[PDB]
Amino acid sequence: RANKDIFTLFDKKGQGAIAKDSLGDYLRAIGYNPTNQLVQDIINADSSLRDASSLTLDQITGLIEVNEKELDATTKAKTEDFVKAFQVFDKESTGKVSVGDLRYMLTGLGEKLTDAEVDELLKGVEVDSNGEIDYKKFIEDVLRQ
Amino acid sequence: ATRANKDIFTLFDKKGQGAIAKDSLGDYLRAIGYNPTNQLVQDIINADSSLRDASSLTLDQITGLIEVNEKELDATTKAKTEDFVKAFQVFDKESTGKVSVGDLRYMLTGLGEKLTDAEVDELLKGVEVDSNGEIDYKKFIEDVLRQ
Amino acid sequence: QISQAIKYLQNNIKGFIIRQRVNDEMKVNCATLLQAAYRGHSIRANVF
């Protein structure tokens, strides 16, 4: 998915290179959905970048090729896959999850999101009297966008 | 059944090689719902030349082992709360129905098939311990057997 | 006279621990895959 035009947008200085720390968002900008961990491993698996402060389109392009397989996998999953995996947080299969549990898994597990990012995701999301949300609709409404 | 157990297998197959280290067999059996002793797991492995000589096991091989030893494995899922009441009695002679975390650790790590402190600590994460550092052992047993 | 019961309890405890461990890993994995999808979607929505 390597794309020069997107690289250009990121290279706001036209210096022909973007901050190494901006690698993850560039990969996301071009279409992949890598975890922050994968982005770090990609950068770390290349000894040459050890003291690199920035990355050129050529270097980035090489990293995409070497890790093409894993990066591509981050795009395969469909909405139904997340819904299926979310069942671990709903054993009663009630199809519902408390906003409390949802905020916890989003801000307390994995690559934690901030409370502010979660507050934003919950904007408009319907919460019933029991204080639960339909996670299938939630997941759908977050991705289908 | 298989779908859930297949995903558990996938979870164990870290290298995504379609096979898991033979040494993880007991944990996989535990993960899918059984409570075998480490001994039963070794007896299963040592009895089958293919298993015994293998370094890793595919889901197919495991599904095969389960079939063969299904009766013995199913027998590990029959424990009842009452089967352990007397064990705790040794540390609750006044029948308060409670035991301190200290005595639980002593029983689990110093008696029987000794568990490690790390195992007990992991266990305690899913156990209800009050502010007094004590455990209702009837509830504890229920949660442990809960599945 | 209590060694049998203790051993049985310990076997059930080992099963309990693994299942808890697996369940927690599945929760972490679920959170992680969902967070990654959110970040990808979010970055793109903001870039374009």
The phi and psi torsions of A121 (rounded to 5 degrees) equal -65, -30
> DSSP state, A16?
S
Residues A64 and A13 in one domain: yes
C32 neighbors A110 (Cβ within 8 angstroms): yes
CATH class of the region C1-48: mainly alpha
Burial pattern B93-112, b for ≥16 Cβ within 10 A else e, equals eeeeebbebebbbebbbebb
Distance CA B22, CA B24 (A): 5
Instruction: Quote the domain boundaries for residue A24.
Output: 1-70
Distance CA B37, CA A64 (A): 47
Smallest CA–CA separation between C8 and chain B, in Å? 8
Query: Could you identify the residue written with the tokens 């082992």?
Result: B65
In-domain check, residue B147: no
Q: The tokens of A63 are what?
A: 């990293």
Residues B94 and B46 in one domain: no
Residue of B nearest to C12 (CA): B35
In-domain check, residue A145: no
Beta pairing, strands A132-134 & B19-21: unpaired
Residues A28 and A44 in one domain: yes
Residues B61 and B14 in one domain: yes
Domain boundary among A36, A70, A104: A70
CA B94 to the chain's CA centroid:
30
> DSSP state, A32?
-
Distance CA B104, CA B84 (A): 12
- Whether B130 has a binding-site annotation, put simply, is yes
**Inter-chain contact C3–B112, Cβ cutoff 8 Å?**
yes
Distance CA A144, CA C38 (A): 11
Separation in Å, CA A65 to CA A2, A12, A61, C44: 9, 25, 6, 21
B36 in the Ramachandran plot: left (φ > 0), alpha (ψ -120 to 50) or beta? beta
Distance CA B140, CA B98 (A): 10
Residues B87 and B134 in one domain: yes
Q: How many CB atoms lie within 10 A of CB B78?
A: 10
B123 neighbors B90 (Cβ within 8 angstroms): no
C2 neighbors B86 (Cβ within 8 angstroms): yes
Sequence length of chain A is 145
Distance CA B88, CA B135 (A): 11
Distance CA B111, CA C2 (A): 9
Q: Can you spell out the DSSP letters for B29-83?
A: HHHTT----HHHHHHHHHH-HHHHH-SEEEHHHHHHHHHHTHHHHHGGG---THH
Residue C10 near chain B (CB below 8 Å): yes
Residue partners of A17: CB distance under 8 A and separation at least 6: A11, A54, A55, A56
The phi and psi torsions of B99 (rounded to 5 degrees) equal -140, 150
Q: How many CB atoms lie within 10 A of CB C19?
A: 20
Domain boundary among A70, A99, A116: A70
Distance CA C33, CA A82 (A): 8
Residues B91 and B102 in one domain: yes
Torsion sign across C-alpha atoms A57, A63, A66, A70: negative
Smallest CA–CA separation between B62 and chain C, in Å? 17
Q: How many domains does chain B have?
A: 2
**CATH number of the domain residue B103 falls in:** 1.10.238.10
Reported as type and span, the H/E element at residue A54 is strand A54-55
What is the resolution of the experimental data for this entry, in Å?
Answer: 2.0
Cβ contacts below 8 Å, chain A against chain C, sum to 81
